[PDB]
């Protein structure tokens, strides 16, 4: 049948960027224009593909990665970018083929005192590889003194909370991100646009 | 650490129960304390958890607005309160530590468990997202396998699969973390694998002492939570 896109975009729960979610879209027909027509998206950036030609294309593997970041970090989701989110939370490949979609979610993911249940990693010994996910809770050793497993001098817990308050600036307001990854191999297709599909 | 839980409680329908989980060390140091339920006809269900050092919470959609999880580093005790109790809520409620790591398909597992607190509510069915055969039989000294078949949302997405071993009268115990890795104390005869939407647990040199229930755990992004399998009773002839 049709691809489960509303399940990804309209999901009742979004993950923290450090524990970003992934869904495979497979054995389905993908109506992309219903998402590209929508005027609800602050960002719709496609790399290596065209938002229109997608409906006349077929792909071997398609992944939808979802998470929540703040506005000023949406620029980091693009390929070849640097920063805490790109280096330590969600890295895109330089050969990335797919679209990055974002929308302001202040009405859902913000509370007056602050919604602190959305986390990010600001400390890591190495940079993430493309599409790696790090959900470790180990204390980070920012200096030469070992940490002995507890937070202290130059020994930090590597996760902090976005404080999402409705009065914040848009650059500090929560943004929900969905990343469509498109992969074409010499192998059977699992997702095809409608222009290459048969519907009874 | 060792996780010690509260005593058994008998409650009436519509009442509320609040159970406690206290750590031996007395620090709750950078740990994530999760609550996993085992209710007849509903299998193993992750309910939620908290990272005490941050105080941030995470609940399962099925129990949200009905469960409340708190932690207090002073007492080194975490609490879980279930409201509007129903007869189906009768279950062995476990407290467990939630571990993490860094790979492309990394997802949490539960390495340390408590004995479990029993809650009986006095006076339908939940189908698992991961499918296992109810029963598998094997002869001693031969190789046996158990299958776990997730949908596109979990194993198809690439999420790793972990395995838990549960003996009669005991609590679930980690057997395989990651797709193939073994905690210390697990024999080399146990092995794991993942391909496509399915995962496998292989036991070689099968012995009578391997006769137990085996579960597979993955992360389902359609539910945004950890999911367990229906369980497989291995029988050694
Ligand atoms: C996503 O949802 C948008 C809003 O529609 C309303 O909200 C969702 C949660 C459903 O309850 C729906 O029945 C409501 O009408 C829609 O504009 C959009 O088409 C939906 N799907 C996608 C792929 O964006
Ligand atoms: Ca026997
Ligand atoms: Cl949790």
CSV table of C-alpha atoms and ligand atoms in Angstrom, one decimal:
chain,number,residue,atom,x,y,z
A,1,UNK,CA,0.0,0.0,0.0
A,2,UNK,CA,1.0,3.6,0.5
A,3,UNK,CA,4.1,4.4,2.5
A,4,UNK,CA,3.7,5.2,6.2
A,5,UNK,CA,4.8,8.8,6.1
A,6,UNK,CA,2.3,10.4,8.5
A,7,UNK,CA,3.4,7.8,11.1
A,8,UNK,CA,6.8,9.5,10.9
A,9,UNK,CA,5.9,13.1,10.6
A,10,UNK,CA,2.7,13.1,12.7
A,11,UNK,CA,4.2,10.8,15.3
A,12,UNK,CA,2.9,11.4,18.9
A,13,UNK,CA,6.5,11.2,20.2
A,14,UNK,CA,9.8,12.4,18.8
A,15,UNK,CA,13.2,11.2,20.1
A,16,UNK,CA,16.1,13.2,21.5
A,17,UNK,CA,18.7,13.8,18.8
A,18,UNK,CA,21.3,11.8,20.7
A,19,UNK,CA,18.9,8.8,20.6
A,20,UNK,CA,17.5,9.7,17.2
A,21,UNK,CA,14.9,7.4,15.8
A,22,UNK,CA,15.0,5.6,12.4
A,23,UNK,CA,12.3,3.9,10.4
A,24,UNK,CA,12.7,1.9,7.2
A,25,UNK,CA,10.2,2.7,4.4
A,26,UNK,CA,9.8,-0.4,2.3
A,27,UNK,CA,7.4,-2.4,0.1
A,28,UNK,CA,5.3,0.7,-0.5
A,29,UNK,CA,4.5,3.5,-2.9
A,30,UNK,CA,5.7,7.0,-1.7
A,31,UNK,CA,3.6,10.1,-2.6
A,32,UNK,CA,6.3,12.7,-2.0
A,33,UNK,CA,4.4,15.7,-3.3
A,34,UNK,CA,1.9,15.5,-0.4
A,35,UNK,CA,4.9,16.4,1.8
A,36,UNK,CA,6.5,18.9,-0.6
A,37,UNK,CA,3.2,20.7,-1.2
A,38,UNK,CA,2.7,21.3,2.6
A,39,UNK,CA,3.5,24.9,3.6
A,40,UNK,CA,4.1,23.7,7.2
A,41,UNK,CA,7.8,23.0,6.8
A,42,UNK,CA,10.4,25.7,7.7
A,43,UNK,CA,13.2,23.6,5.9
A,44,UNK,CA,12.9,21.3,2.9
A,45,UNK,CA,16.5,20.7,1.6
A,46,UNK,CA,17.1,17.9,-0.8
A,47,UNK,CA,20.7,16.8,-1.7
A,48,UNK,CA,21.6,14.7,-4.7
A,49,UNK,CA,17.9,14.5,-5.8
A,50,UNK,CA,15.1,16.7,-6.9
A,51,UNK,CA,11.8,17.0,-4.9
A,52,UNK,CA,9.8,16.5,-8.1
A,53,UNK,CA,11.8,13.7,-9.8
A,54,UNK,CA,11.3,11.6,-6.6
A,55,UNK,CA,7.8,10.6,-7.7
A,56,UNK,CA,9.3,9.1,-10.8
A,57,UNK,CA,12.1,7.2,-9.1
A,58,UNK,CA,12.6,3.9,-7.3
A,59,UNK,CA,15.0,3.1,-4.5
A,60,UNK,CA,16.6,0.1,-2.8
A,61,UNK,CA,16.7,1.4,0.8
A,62,UNK,CA,14.9,4.4,2.2
A,63,UNK,CA,15.3,5.5,5.9
A,64,UNK,CA,13.4,8.2,7.8
A,65,UNK,CA,15.4,9.5,10.7
A,66,UNK,CA,13.5,11.7,13.2
A,67,UNK,CA,14.7,13.7,16.2
A,68,UNK,CA,14.3,17.1,18.0
A,69,UNK,CA,16.8,19.9,18.0
A,70,UNK,CA,16.7,23.6,18.5
A,71,UNK,CA,16.4,26.0,15.6
A,72,UNK,CA,20.0,27.3,15.4
A,73,UNK,CA,21.1,23.7,14.9
A,74,UNK,CA,19.0,22.8,11.9
A,75,UNK,CA,21.7,24.2,9.7
A,76,UNK,CA,24.0,21.4,11.1
A,77,UNK,CA,21.8,18.6,9.8
A,78,UNK,CA,23.1,19.3,6.3
A,79,UNK,CA,26.1,17.4,4.8
A,80,UNK,CA,29.6,18.6,5.5
A,81,UNK,CA,28.7,20.6,8.6
A,82,UNK,CA,30.4,21.0,12.0
A,83,UNK,CA,29.1,21.6,15.5
A,84,UNK,CA,27.9,19.7,18.6
A,85,UNK,CA,24.9,18.1,16.9
A,86,UNK,CA,26.7,17.0,13.7
A,87,UNK,CA,29.9,15.9,15.4
A,88,UNK,CA,28.4,14.2,18.5
A,89,UNK,CA,24.7,13.5,17.9
A,90,UNK,CA,23.7,13.1,14.2
A,91,UNK,CA,26.2,13.1,11.3
A,92,UNK,CA,25.2,13.1,7.7
A,93,UNK,CA,27.5,11.7,5.0
A,94,UNK,CA,29.1,14.0,2.4
A,95,UNK,CA,27.7,11.8,-0.3
A,96,UNK,CA,24.2,12.2,1.2
A,97,UNK,CA,21.3,11.6,-1.1
A,98,UNK,CA,18.0,12.6,0.4
A,99,UNK,CA,15.9,15.5,1.9
A,100,UNK,CA,16.0,17.2,5.3
A,101,UNK,CA,12.7,18.4,6.5
A,102,UNK,CA,12.2,20.6,9.6
A,103,UNK,CA,9.3,22.5,11.3
A,104,UNK,CA,8.9,24.6,14.4
A,105,UNK,CA,7.3,22.6,17.2
A,106,UNK,CA,7.1,25.2,20.0
A,107,UNK,CA,3.4,24.4,20.5
A,108,UNK,CA,4.1,20.7,21.3
A,109,UNK,CA,7.7,20.4,22.8
A,110,UNK,CA,7.8,23.5,25.1
A,111,UNK,CA,6.7,24.1,28.7
A,112,UNK,CA,6.7,27.3,30.7
A,113,UNK,CA,9.2,26.1,33.3
A,114,UNK,CA,11.0,24.3,30.4
A,115,UNK,CA,10.7,20.9,28.8
A,116,UNK,CA,13.9,19.2,29.9
A,117,UNK,CA,13.1,15.7,28.5
A,118,UNK,CA,14.9,16.5,25.1
A,119,UNK,CA,18.6,15.9,25.5
A,120,UNK,CA,21.8,16.3,23.4
A,121,UNK,CA,25.4,15.1,23.8
A,122,UNK,CA,27.9,17.9,24.1
A,123,UNK,CA,30.9,15.8,25.0
A,124,UNK,CA,32.5,12.9,23.1
A,125,UNK,CA,36.1,11.7,22.7
A,126,UNK,CA,35.6,11.1,18.9
A,127,UNK,CA,33.3,12.5,16.3
A,128,UNK,CA,30.4,10.4,15.2
A,129,UNK,CA,30.6,8.4,12.0
A,130,UNK,CA,27.8,9.0,9.4
A,131,UNK,CA,24.6,7.5,10.8
A,132,UNK,CA,26.1,6.2,14.0
A,133,UNK,CA,24.1,6.5,17.2
A,134,UNK,CA,25.7,7.0,20.6
A,135,UNK,CA,23.5,6.5,23.6
A,136,UNK,CA,26.2,6.0,26.2
A,137,UNK,CA,25.8,7.5,29.7
A,138,UNK,CA,29.5,7.3,30.6
A,139,UNK,CA,31.2,10.2,32.4
A,140,UNK,CA,33.4,12.3,30.1
A,141,UNK,CA,37.0,12.9,31.2
A,142,UNK,CA,37.8,16.5,29.9
A,143,UNK,CA,41.3,16.4,31.5
A,144,UNK,CA,44.2,14.3,32.7
A,145,UNK,CA,42.6,13.3,36.0
A,146,UNK,CA,40.6,10.0,35.8
A,147,UNK,CA,36.9,10.3,36.7
A,148,UNK,CA,36.4,7.2,38.8
A,149,UNK,CA,32.9,7.0,37.5
A,150,UNK,CA,31.5,10.1,39.1
A,151,UNK,CA,31.0,13.7,38.0
A,152,UNK,CA,33.7,16.1,39.2
A,153,UNK,CA,36.6,18.4,38.2
A,154,UNK,CA,36.9,18.1,34.4
A,155,UNK,CA,34.7,15.0,34.7
A,156,UNK,CA,31.2,15.7,33.3
A,157,UNK,CA,28.1,13.8,32.5
A,158,UNK,CA,28.0,14.0,28.7
A,159,UNK,CA,24.3,14.8,28.2
A,160,UNK,CA,22.5,18.1,28.9
A,161,UNK,CA,18.9,19.1,28.4
A,162,UNK,CA,17.4,21.6,26.1
A,163,UNK,CA,15.3,23.9,28.2
A,164,UNK,CA,12.4,24.5,25.8
A,165,UNK,CA,10.5,27.5,27.0
A,166,UNK,CA,7.7,29.0,24.9
A,167,UNK,CA,9.1,32.6,25.3
A,168,UNK,CA,12.5,31.7,23.9
A,169,UNK,CA,13.8,32.9,20.6
A,170,UNK,CA,13.2,30.8,17.5
A,171,UNK,CA,16.9,29.9,17.4
A,172,UNK,CA,16.3,28.3,20.9
A,173,UNK,CA,12.8,27.0,20.1
A,174,UNK,CA,12.3,23.2,19.4
A,175,UNK,CA,12.4,22.0,15.8
A,176,UNK,CA,11.3,18.6,14.7
A,177,UNK,CA,13.5,17.1,12.0
A,178,UNK,CA,12.9,14.2,9.6
A,179,UNK,CA,15.7,13.1,7.4
A,180,UNK,CA,14.8,11.0,4.3
A,181,UNK,CA,17.8,8.9,3.1
A,182,UNK,CA,17.7,7.5,-0.4
A,183,UNK,CA,19.9,4.6,-1.5
A,184,UNK,CA,20.0,3.2,-5.0
A,185,UNK,CA,21.8,-0.2,-5.4
A,186,UNK,CA,21.9,-2.9,-8.1
A,187,UNK,CA,19.2,-4.7,-6.1
A,188,UNK,CA,15.4,-4.9,-6.0
A,189,UNK,CA,13.5,-1.8,-5.1
A,190,UNK,CA,11.5,-1.5,-2.0
A,191,UNK,CA,10.0,2.0,-2.5
A,192,UNK,CA,8.8,3.6,-5.8
A,193,UNK,CA,7.2,6.9,-6.6
A,194,UNK,CA,3.6,6.7,-7.9
A,195,UNK,CA,4.6,7.5,-11.5
A,196,UNK,CA,6.2,4.0,-11.5
A,197,UNK,CA,3.5,2.2,-9.6
A,198,UNK,CA,0.3,0.2,-10.2
A,199,UNK,CA,-2.8,0.7,-8.1
A,200,UNK,CA,-5.9,-1.5,-8.2
B,1,UNK,CA,25.3,-2.9,42.0
B,2,UNK,CA,22.4,-4.9,43.3
B,3,UNK,CA,18.8,-3.6,42.9
B,4,UNK,CA,16.5,-4.3,45.9
B,5,UNK,CA,12.8,-3.7,45.5
B,6,UNK,CA,9.8,-3.3,47.7
B,7,UNK,CA,7.5,-6.0,49.0
B,8,UNK,CA,4.4,-7.5,47.4
B,9,UNK,CA,1.2,-5.5,47.4
B,10,UNK,CA,-2.4,-6.5,46.9
B,11,UNK,CA,-4.5,-3.6,45.6
B,12,UNK,CA,-8.1,-3.2,44.5
B,13,UNK,CA,-9.4,-2.0,41.1
B,14,UNK,CA,-9.0,1.7,40.6
B,15,UNK,CA,-6.4,2.0,43.4
B,16,UNK,CA,-2.8,3.0,43.0
B,17,UNK,CA,0.5,1.3,43.9
B,18,UNK,CA,3.9,2.9,44.4
B,19,UNK,CA,6.9,0.6,44.3
B,20,UNK,CA,10.5,1.4,45.3
B,21,UNK,CA,13.9,0.5,43.9
B,22,UNK,CA,17.0,1.1,46.0
B,23,UNK,CA,20.6,0.7,44.8
B,24,UNK,CA,23.2,-1.0,47.0
B,25,UNK,CA,26.0,1.5,46.4
B,26,UNK,CA,23.9,4.5,47.4
B,27,UNK,CA,24.7,6.9,44.5
B,28,UNK,CA,22.6,6.2,41.4
B,29,UNK,CA,25.8,7.4,39.6
B,30,UNK,CA,25.0,8.3,35.9
B,31,UNK,CA,22.7,5.3,35.7
B,32,UNK,CA,19.3,5.0,34.0
B,33,UNK,CA,16.8,3.1,36.1
B,34,UNK,CA,14.0,1.6,34.1
B,35,UNK,CA,10.9,-0.4,35.1
B,36,UNK,CA,10.0,-3.5,33.1
B,37,UNK,CA,6.7,-5.3,33.7
B,38,UNK,CA,5.8,-8.9,33.1
B,39,UNK,CA,2.0,-9.4,33.1
B,40,UNK,CA,0.2,-12.6,32.2
B,41,UNK,CA,-1.0,-12.4,28.6
B,42,UNK,CA,0.9,-9.2,27.9
B,43,UNK,CA,4.5,-10.4,28.0
B,44,UNK,CA,7.5,-8.3,28.9
B,45,UNK,CA,6.6,-4.6,28.8
B,46,UNK,CA,9.0,-1.6,29.2
B,47,UNK,CA,7.1,1.0,31.2
B,48,UNK,CA,9.6,3.9,31.5
B,49,UNK,CA,12.6,5.1,33.3
B,50,UNK,CA,14.6,8.1,34.7
B,51,UNK,CA,18.1,9.4,34.6
B,52,UNK,CA,18.4,10.6,38.3
B,53,UNK,CA,21.5,12.8,37.7
B,54,UNK,CA,19.5,14.8,35.2
B,55,UNK,CA,16.0,14.0,36.6
B,56,UNK,CA,14.6,13.5,33.1
B,57,UNK,CA,11.9,10.9,32.5
B,58,UNK,CA,10.8,8.7,29.7
B,59,UNK,CA,7.5,6.8,29.6
B,60,UNK,CA,5.9,4.2,27.3
B,61,UNK,CA,2.8,5.5,25.4
B,62,UNK,CA,0.6,2.7,26.8
B,63,UNK,CA,1.2,3.7,30.4
B,64,UNK,CA,1.7,7.5,30.1
B,65,UNK,CA,-0.7,9.6,32.2
B,66,UNK,CA,-1.0,6.4,34.2
B,67,UNK,CA,2.6,5.8,35.4
B,68,UNK,CA,4.8,8.3,37.3
B,69,UNK,CA,8.5,7.7,37.8
B,70,UNK,CA,10.6,9.6,40.3
B,71,UNK,CA,14.1,9.3,41.8
B,72,UNK,CA,15.9,10.7,44.8
B,73,UNK,CA,19.7,10.5,45.1
B,74,UNK,CA,19.5,11.3,48.8
B,75,UNK,CA,17.7,8.0,49.5
B,76,UNK,CA,19.2,6.4,46.3
B,77,UNK,CA,15.7,5.1,45.7
B,78,UNK,CA,13.6,5.4,42.5
B,79,UNK,CA,9.8,5.1,42.6
B,80,UNK,CA,7.2,4.0,40.1
B,81,UNK,CA,3.5,4.8,40.7
B,82,UNK,CA,0.7,3.2,38.6
B,83,UNK,CA,-2.7,4.7,38.8
B,84,UNK,CA,-6.2,3.5,37.9
B,85,UNK,CA,-5.2,-0.1,38.5
B,86,UNK,CA,-7.0,-2.8,36.5
B,87,UNK,CA,-7.1,-6.6,36.9
B,88,UNK,CA,-4.8,-6.9,33.9
B,89,UNK,CA,-2.1,-4.9,35.7
B,90,UNK,CA,-1.4,-8.0,37.9
B,91,UNK,CA,2.3,-8.5,37.1
B,92,UNK,CA,5.9,-9.1,38.3
B,93,UNK,CA,7.2,-5.5,38.2
B,94,UNK,CA,11.0,-5.4,37.7
B,95,UNK,CA,13.5,-2.6,38.2
B,96,UNK,CA,16.5,-2.7,35.9
B,97,UNK,CA,19.5,-0.6,34.8
B,98,UNK,CA,19.5,0.5,31.2
B,99,UNK,CA,22.8,0.3,29.4
B,100,UNK,CA,24.0,2.1,26.2
B,101,UNK,CA,26.8,2.1,23.7
B,102,UNK,CA,27.8,3.6,20.3
B,103,UNK,CA,27.1,1.9,17.0
B,104,UNK,CA,25.0,2.6,13.9
B,105,UNK,CA,22.1,0.6,15.2
B,106,UNK,CA,22.7,1.0,18.9
B,107,UNK,CA,19.7,0.6,21.3
B,108,UNK,CA,19.4,0.1,25.0
B,109,UNK,CA,19.5,-3.2,26.9
B,110,UNK,CA,18.9,-4.2,30.5
B,111,UNK,CA,21.9,-5.8,32.2
B,112,UNK,CA,21.1,-5.7,35.9
B,113,UNK,CA,17.6,-6.7,37.2
B,114,UNK,CA,15.9,-7.0,40.5
B,115,UNK,CA,14.0,-10.0,41.8
B,116,UNK,CA,10.8,-8.1,41.1
B,117,UNK,CA,7.9,-6.8,43.1
B,118,UNK,CA,4.6,-8.6,42.7
B,119,UNK,CA,1.4,-6.5,42.5
B,120,UNK,CA,-2.0,-8.3,42.4
B,121,UNK,CA,-5.1,-6.3,41.4
B,122,UNK,CA,-8.1,-8.2,42.8
B,123,UNK,CA,-11.6,-8.6,41.3
B,124,UNK,CA,-7.6,-8.4,26.4
B,125,UNK,CA,-4.3,-9.6,25.1
B,126,UNK,CA,-1.2,-7.7,24.0
B,127,UNK,CA,0.5,-9.0,20.8
B,128,UNK,CA,4.2,-8.6,20.7
B,129,UNK,CA,5.9,-6.5,18.0
B,130,UNK,CA,8.7,-9.1,17.8
B,131,UNK,CA,7.6,-12.6,17.0
B,132,UNK,CA,9.1,-15.8,18.4
B,133,UNK,CA,8.0,-19.4,18.2
B,134,UNK,CA,6.2,-20.4,21.4
B,135,UNK,CA,8.2,-23.7,21.6
B,136,UNK,CA,11.5,-25.1,20.3
B,137,UNK,CA,12.8,-28.6,21.1
B,138,UNK,CA,16.3,-30.0,20.8
B,139,UNK,CA,18.3,-33.0,21.5
B,140,UNK,CA,21.3,-32.9,23.9
B,141,UNK,CA,24.7,-32.2,22.4
B,142,UNK,CA,23.1,-30.8,19.2
B,143,UNK,CA,22.7,-27.2,17.9
B,144,UNK,CA,19.4,-25.4,18.3
B,145,UNK,CA,18.1,-22.0,17.1
B,146,UNK,CA,15.5,-19.5,18.1
B,147,UNK,CA,14.1,-16.9,15.7
B,148,UNK,CA,13.0,-13.3,16.3
B,149,UNK,CA,11.0,-11.6,13.5
B,150,UNK,CA,10.5,-7.9,13.8
B,151,UNK,CA,8.8,-5.6,11.4
B,152,UNK,CA,10.3,-2.8,9.2
B,153,UNK,CA,10.1,-0.3,12.1
B,154,UNK,CA,12.6,-2.1,14.4
B,155,UNK,CA,14.9,-4.8,13.1
B,156,UNK,CA,14.2,-3.8,9.5
B,157,UNK,CA,15.4,-0.3,10.4
B,158,UNK,CA,18.6,-1.9,11.7
B,159,UNK,CA,18.1,-1.7,15.5
B,160,UNK,CA,20.2,-4.2,17.4
B,161,UNK,CA,18.7,-7.2,19.1
B,162,UNK,CA,19.4,-8.4,22.7
B,163,UNK,CA,18.5,-11.7,24.3
B,164,UNK,CA,17.3,-12.5,27.8
B,165,UNK,CA,17.2,-15.9,29.6
B,166,UNK,CA,14.5,-16.6,32.2
B,167,UNK,CA,14.3,-19.8,34.4
B,168,UNK,CA,11.2,-20.8,36.3
B,169,UNK,CA,10.7,-18.8,39.5
B,170,UNK,CA,13.5,-16.3,38.5
B,171,UNK,CA,13.8,-13.0,36.8
B,172,UNK,CA,15.0,-12.3,33.2
B,173,UNK,CA,18.8,-12.2,32.8
B,174,UNK,CA,20.9,-10.7,30.0
B,175,UNK,CA,22.2,-13.4,27.6
B,176,UNK,CA,23.2,-11.6,24.5
B,177,UNK,CA,23.8,-7.8,24.2
B,178,UNK,CA,24.5,-6.3,20.9
B,179,UNK,CA,23.7,-8.7,18.1
B,180,UNK,CA,26.4,-11.2,19.0
B,181,UNK,CA,28.2,-10.1,22.3
B,182,UNK,CA,28.0,-12.1,25.5
B,183,UNK,CA,28.3,-10.8,29.1
B,184,UNK,CA,30.8,-12.6,31.3
B,185,UNK,CA,29.2,-15.8,32.7
B,186,UNK,CA,27.5,-16.8,29.4
B,187,UNK,CA,28.9,-19.9,27.7
B,188,UNK,CA,30.4,-19.8,24.2
B,189,UNK,CA,27.7,-22.2,23.1
B,190,UNK,CA,25.3,-19.2,23.0
B,191,UNK,CA,25.6,-17.0,19.9
B,192,UNK,CA,23.6,-14.3,18.2
B,193,UNK,CA,23.1,-12.9,14.7
B,194,UNK,CA,20.9,-10.4,12.8
B,195,UNK,CA,19.9,-10.2,9.2
B,196,UNK,CA,17.1,-8.2,7.6
B,197,UNK,CA,14.0,-8.0,9.8
B,198,UNK,CA,15.0,-11.2,11.7
B,199,UNK,CA,17.5,-12.1,14.4
B,200,UNK,CA,18.7,-15.5,15.7
B,201,UNK,CA,19.9,-17.0,18.9
B,202,UNK,CA,22.0,-20.2,18.4
B,203,UNK,CA,22.8,-22.7,21.2
B,204,UNK,CA,25.3,-25.4,20.4
B,205,UNK,CA,26.2,-28.4,22.6
B,206,UNK,CA,22.7,-28.1,24.0
B,207,UNK,CA,22.4,-29.2,27.7
B,208,UNK,CA,19.4,-29.8,30.0
B,209,UNK,CA,20.5,-26.7,32.0
B,210,UNK,CA,19.6,-24.5,29.0
B,211,UNK,CA,15.9,-25.4,29.3
B,212,UNK,CA,14.3,-22.0,29.9
B,213,UNK,CA,12.4,-19.1,28.3
B,214,UNK,CA,14.3,-16.8,25.9
B,215,UNK,CA,13.2,-13.3,24.9
B,216,UNK,CA,14.5,-10.9,22.2
B,217,UNK,CA,14.6,-7.2,22.7
B,218,UNK,CA,14.7,-4.4,20.1
B,219,UNK,CA,13.7,-0.7,19.7
B,220,UNK,CA,10.6,0.1,17.8
B,221,UNK,CA,10.5,3.6,16.5
B,222,UNK,CA,6.8,3.4,15.7
B,223,UNK,CA,6.2,3.2,19.4
B,224,UNK,CA,9.4,5.0,20.4
B,225,UNK,CA,10.3,2.5,23.1
B,226,UNK,CA,12.0,-0.8,23.8
B,227,UNK,CA,10.1,-3.9,22.8
B,228,UNK,CA,10.3,-7.5,23.8
B,229,UNK,CA,9.5,-10.8,22.1
B,230,UNK,CA,6.7,-13.2,23.0
B,231,UNK,CA,9.2,-15.6,24.4
B,232,UNK,CA,10.3,-19.1,23.4
B,233,UNK,CA,10.3,-22.1,25.8
B,234,UNK,CA,13.3,-24.3,24.8
B,235,UNK,CA,12.8,-28.0,25.6
B,236,UNK,CA,15.7,-30.4,25.9
B,237,UNK,CA,14.6,-34.0,25.1
C,1,LIG,C1,-0.3,14.7,9.2
C,1,LIG,O1,-1.3,15.5,10.0
C,1,LIG,C2,-1.7,16.7,9.4
C,1,LIG,C3,-2.8,17.2,10.3
C,1,LIG,O2,-3.9,16.5,10.2
C,1,LIG,C4,-4.6,16.2,11.5
C,1,LIG,O3,-3.6,15.7,12.5
C,1,LIG,C5,-3.2,14.3,12.4
C,1,LIG,C6,-2.4,14.0,13.6
C,1,LIG,C7,-4.4,13.4,12.2
C,1,LIG,O4,-5.2,13.3,13.4
C,1,LIG,C8,-5.2,13.8,11.0
C,1,LIG,O5,-6.3,12.9,10.9
C,1,LIG,C9,-5.7,15.2,11.2
C,1,LIG,O6,-6.6,15.7,10.2
C,1,LIG,C10,-2.3,16.4,7.9
C,1,LIG,O7,-2.4,17.7,7.3
C,1,LIG,C11,-1.3,15.6,7.1
C,1,LIG,O8,-1.9,15.2,5.9
C,1,LIG,C12,-0.9,14.3,7.9
C,1,LIG,N1,0.0,13.5,7.1
C,1,LIG,C13,1.2,13.9,6.7
C,1,LIG,C14,1.9,12.8,5.9
C,1,LIG,O9,1.7,15.0,6.9
C,2,LIG,CA1,13.4,-31.2,30.5
C,3,LIG,CL1,13.8,4.3,30.3
